[PDB]
């Protein structure tokens, strides 16, 4: 299972 | 700054005459993830070839397998025609049955 | 033995055709087991393995969800980086990730792993130690100061140490059959002479699983590293890898060479030579 991406760069 | 594809052409199976096998055309090792590969039968396009979906190395140079249902023969001649960025021309590797 | 599940995400720009494409893989070990493609008629994660399919609808809508989201956190990102490397906005460019954890064979947790590269250089990876940042270039480093603030590896660690650990103990639990079986490599040496004076001995492994092998060619016992031509573990497309090594060798002198394969499935490495 993956994530969201926690923050933009 | 771009990397050029590695290129192997080779059978899923050991290659038996009137045997029916995969042709797989592998390429490896380039960036950008842009790449265009034909699978050809006596110099002709071979249809509806499919691919894997794309993914890449610790390095982060992509990869792809393309491949097709084949009935290798003593006459019929297969090869792989690669396109790339970093090519001029296509680049055209021929399938020899012991690589 | 010990394992691993690993995403690769890979967001690439295309001015003048349309938003940046992204696309999502998920693998355990050597073994693909989802997809997810923003170019696609219309997308979805879809199952890549037969041991996926039985997760429910939940985790096919979350995971949907949670893709056509990032697909656009990919498209920030890409004009993020066309600031911060001053470039124009003709180019094509790309972003990706890699993402996931290694686990021995007890399940615990060996290592996490969060890290992301553009236009195929190093940009920022999350260290071992699931805490701190490597920049690699002034760029990234606003990028670090930014997730520094916003205490982004926290998070990340978070991740790693539970939902990734936790979905790859069940993945490989709902894979067993598969993903908790080596296939050892067939081999065989074969010979062919490139004229009177030299042949081409080339060391064959087929069929076998995981893709990790060792196949070497030794001359009276000593390792033939600069002289040995070893193509790339490729794959056969049925799930398994194939691998050779060849030696140019002096007519004659056939029988001081061996070939050396090691493998998980192989309780013992094996040492071979050309049977004529």
Excluded at chain 3, 225 to 243: H, N, S
Excluded at chain 3, 247 to 268: A, D, F, I, M, N
């Amino acid at each position: 299972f993956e994530d969201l991406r926690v923050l933009s760069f | 700054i771009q990397r050029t594809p590695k290129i192997q052409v080779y059978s899923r199976h050991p290659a038996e005459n009137g045997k029916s096998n995969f042709l797989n055309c592998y390429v490896s090792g380039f960036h950008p993830s842009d790449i265009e590969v034909d699978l050809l039968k006596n110099g002709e396009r071979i249809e509806k070839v499919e691919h894997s979906d794309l993914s890449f190395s610790k390095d982060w140079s992509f990869y792809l397998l393309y491949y097709t249902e084949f009935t290798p023969t003593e006459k019929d001649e297969y090869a792989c025609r690669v396109n790339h960025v970093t090519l001029s021309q296509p680049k055209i590797v021929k399938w020899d049955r012991d690589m | 033995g010990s394992h691993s599940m690993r995403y690769f995400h890979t967001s690439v720009s295309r001015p003048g055709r349309g938003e940046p494409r992204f696309i999502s893989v998920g693998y355990v070990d050597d073994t693909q087991f989802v997809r997810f493609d923003s170019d696609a008629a219309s997308p979805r994660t879809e199952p890549r393995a037969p041991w996926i399919e039985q997760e429910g609808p939940e985790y096919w809508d979350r995971e949907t969800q949670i893709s056509k989201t990032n697909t656009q956190t990919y498209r920030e990102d890409l004009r993020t980086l066309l600031r911060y490397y001053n470039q124009s906005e003709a180019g094509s460019h790309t972003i990706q990730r890699m993402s996931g954890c290694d686990v021995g064979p007890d399940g615990r947790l060996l290592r996490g792993y969060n890290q992301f590269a553009y236009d195929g250089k190093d940009y920022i990876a999350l260290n071992e130690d699931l805490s701190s940042w490597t920049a690699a270039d002034t760029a990234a480093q606003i990028t670090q100061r930014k997730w520094e603030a916003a205490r982004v590896a926290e998070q990340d660690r978070a991740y790693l140490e539970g939902t990734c650990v936790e979905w790859l103990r069940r993945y490989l639990e709902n894979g067993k059959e598969t993903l908790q079986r080596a296939d050892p490599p067939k081999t065989h040496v074969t010979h062919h002479p490139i004229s009177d004076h030299e042949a081409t001995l080339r060391c064959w492994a087929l069929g076998f699983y995981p893709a990790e092998i060792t196949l070497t060619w030794q001359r009276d016992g000593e390792d033939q590293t600069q002289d040995t031509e070893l193509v790339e573990t490729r794959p056969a497309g049925d799930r398994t890898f194939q691998k050779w090594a060849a030696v140019v060798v002096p007519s004659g002198e056939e029988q001081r060479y061996t070939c050396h394969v090691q493998h998980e499935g192989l309780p013992k490495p094996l040492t071979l030579r050309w049977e004529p």
